[PDB]
Design a protein around this ligand. Structure first.
Ligand SMILES: [Cl-]
Ligand SMILES: [Cl-]
Length: 129
């Protein structure tokens, strides 16, 4: 599923991401835009052979099991394929563990490079939340 901006904001808001660890909702929408273009089915392969999955491009190196990232961890205890669902619950729940791991949203390269220090509230402007 390819979400609309406001549709995704509202789904994220319902799943407790607004202000989660001090990150306002615009941060999460912005990250999703630049990570996946709001497409729950996004995959991208990293040079190390790990893969990034779903709306927030969560990496098989640490976070999920895809059966083909030898010597990786499954810290969110999920098949990576569950991150590709049109229901973003598993992505959001895993994202919460990532953002809590000490690096905040800096874990998301596109967040760091494209959202951080910008006006992120613009990403939810206009939305009925
Ligand atoms: Cl694996
Ligand atoms: Cl980037």
């Amino acid at each position: 599923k390819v979400f609309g901006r406001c549709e995704l904001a509202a789904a994220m808001k319902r799943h407790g991401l607004d202000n989660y660890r001090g990150y306002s909702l615009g941060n999460w929408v912005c990250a999703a835009k630049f990570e996946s273009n709001f497409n729950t089915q996004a995959t991208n392969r990293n040079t190390d052979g790990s893969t990034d999955y779903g709306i927030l491009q969560i990496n098989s190196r640490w976070w999920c099991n895809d059966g083909r990232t030898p010597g990786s961890r499954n810290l969110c205890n999920i098949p990576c394929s569950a991150l590709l669902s049109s229901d973003i619950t598993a992505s959001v729940n895993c994202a919460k563990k990532i953002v809590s791991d000490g690096n905040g949203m800096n874990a998301w390269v596109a967040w760091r490079n494209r959202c951080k220090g910008t006006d992120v509230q613009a990403w939810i402007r206009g939305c009925r939340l």
